[PDB]
Every structure is written in C-alpha cells, then in structure tokens.
Symmetry: C3
Subunit: 109 residues, 3 copies
Amino acid sequence: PFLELDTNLPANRVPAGLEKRLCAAAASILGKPADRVNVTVRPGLAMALSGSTEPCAQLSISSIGVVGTAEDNRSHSAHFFEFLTKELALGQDRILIRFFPLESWQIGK
Amino acid sequence: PFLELDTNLPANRVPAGLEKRLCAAAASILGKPADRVNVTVRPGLAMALSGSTEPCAQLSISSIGVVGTAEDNRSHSAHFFEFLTKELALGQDRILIRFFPLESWQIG
Amino acid sequence: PFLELDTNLPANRVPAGLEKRLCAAAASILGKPADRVNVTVRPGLAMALSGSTEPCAQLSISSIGVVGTAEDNRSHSAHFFEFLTKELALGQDRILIRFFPLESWQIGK
C-alpha cells in the first residue's frame, strides 16, 4: 500500500527517519510486507483542520481495489493515531486518516 | 470534504490565511459544516498546465463515495474560480479543479 | 489526464524543464492531446519506496472513469519507466507508477 503524510509542522520539527519507522509501523498494523509499503512525507505545508491552522497531520492510505472494511479501517486508524501522536507530539484531535482505492500500481525491474 | 491546492507560486506569493478563508469559502459553496472541511496548500511546486509552466493552481476535491453530479461539480467550480482568481492573482484559464471520491476518513 | 511525481531528490538534482518534457511524453504514450495533460512535480520530500530511503520517484496518473485496461496500463508503464530513469538518473526498481480514476475535472475559460 501507499502512505502519504501531509503536515504543517516544518521539516526541522518533523523527526528524522519518520518515513522508515512509519513504513515498519504500517506493515505490522495492516498485515502487509514492508517491501509493499510505500511512504511519502510532505512537510512545511499550510493546512486547516476543523477551521484551525494549529499544527496538524493528514495521513492518506491508498491500496488496489478495496483498502479495507469499515471495521478493519477504524481498528487500523486507532494504531495509526497511537503512533503519530507519539512521533509528532500532536494531539490525536489534530491527526486525520483518509482511505481511497487505486486501479493498479507497478514497481519497475 | 478535503481540498488540496497545488501551485507553482512560491510561499512568499500566497496570501497568509488562504487555508482558513479557503476553508470557509468551501463550507458555504459545497454546503457542508466548516468543522468537516479540511484544507492543504502545497506551494513551490514545478507545474505544467496545458503545456505552459506559467503560474497555475490545481484544486483537488474529495469526499466519501461520490463528490457531486456533473452539474453540481461545474456549478461548484464556477464559485471556486471567482475566489481563487482574486486570492492568487491568477487567470481562470490557469485554474484546474479535479473531484475524486474516498472510501472513508476519521479525525481523532 | 493528470500526472503527479513525488521524489526525495532535491530540486537541484531534478533537471530543469522536466515538467514540460513529461507533459509531451504523457501525450504520446497515453494517446491524449497535450492541452488535456496536467503535470505536478513535488521534490525534496521524505520517501521510503519498497522499504528504502535511497533516491526514488512515484508517479501518479489519474483520468476520469477508468485510466485504462490492465494491458494498456502495463504497456504505458513500460514507456514511463524508459523516460524517468534517463531524466532522473535512477534505476527502474526505484520508480513506482499508480493509477486511480477521477469523477470530474474542469479548466477555467
């Protein structure tokens, strides 16, 4: 799958190596091999969540066909909130997690 | 709903507080509460809209299952152009609005 | 159609004019007019693709309805891999391609 973290924390305030810890974190949370787990982090963005530009993070999780059941997604979101709140020092109320399906994806070679 | 604005204008040239005003414009145009409208703005990007790398903006709108009809999507667009032309100092022919659905989302 | 390229490469290592050349190649490869092709490059990101922090690039392709058949998507991918390895000086194993459908899109008059 694919994890995209957008945050309005600057880069110098986003921990180093987050991209790989996050990567390992997802694999064990989702029941994916970490060789299938692809992570993009984009910091220093301008964001408003609930009409507030206080520090916040948005995590998009994309997969082929179906990303998960409504029940499996809530349960997985819980573990994602536990992890990012510790990693970023944000309140859980400042973390969003969206899901969308993809049509396909190919790695080269 | 989620609104992602991608632009090749640097941050110095994007008005302070766009994300906030953008957020209240979206609630009233889409008719959704302001607590459910989430806004990301990503500037300093390299962009080519219709072969041209002149200043441009892409606004992606997303929501659960469906976003809108053909008609509601074009109506909603006309409103976003009037807001974004003024706020970014851009022509309407340099603004692109894409709609794509979500499986779900949750805030904490 | 829309093309989104995320890379951990800093902008000084992304060739100048890449966003123009990529629009022209998209048109020929996907078989679409160049007025209708839309490119975004976001460099200087923190990525981990197939569990590695080494230089990489994921490209996201997205048209309305269905981007393509598996067959045409496979063939198109192979052409994109040919293009981005020579432009970005990465190997195919560090380039990923995603396909997801859109509902609607509109350019201002």
